[PDB]
Design a protein around this ligand. Structure first.
Ligand code: CU1
Lengths: 72, 72
């Protein structure tokens, strides 16, 4: 029942970039995450019960550059 | 082994899109070669010993829409 909030600074330079990241993150099994992406700010907010390493790994496996992440 | 030539029409709208595709494909070396990505024509052209479905799924992990693929 603990929700973790992670925020990632991901290099997304078009709505194709942000849309791709959304597609992969919203398709994650099990369905235990809410995903909010701001193209303008280059931010991916993930609210989830999954660990930080796992979510980070899922984003890196898209090929997108992840400049930083953190737990809020 | 049989080296096949695959070409994919991938919806890549910026260099962030194509760079990501390139990064996931270059991870399959040395089982893929001649990675040729055209942002302009939205084409990804590779030589590989891997099955088509494997390469297709690997490209799809970027989150990009793959409109079509062919064997040349
Ligand atoms: Cu893009």
């Amino acid at each position: 029942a603990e929700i973790k909030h992670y925020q990632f600074n991901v290099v997304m330079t078009c709505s194709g970039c942000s849309g791709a990241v959304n597609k992969v993150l919203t398709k994650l099994e099990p369905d235990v995450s809410k995903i909010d992406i701001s193209l303008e700010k280059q931010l991916v907010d993930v609210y989830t019960t999954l660990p930080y390493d796992f979510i980070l790994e899922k984003i890196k496996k898209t090929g997108k550059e992840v400049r930083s992440g953190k737990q809020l």
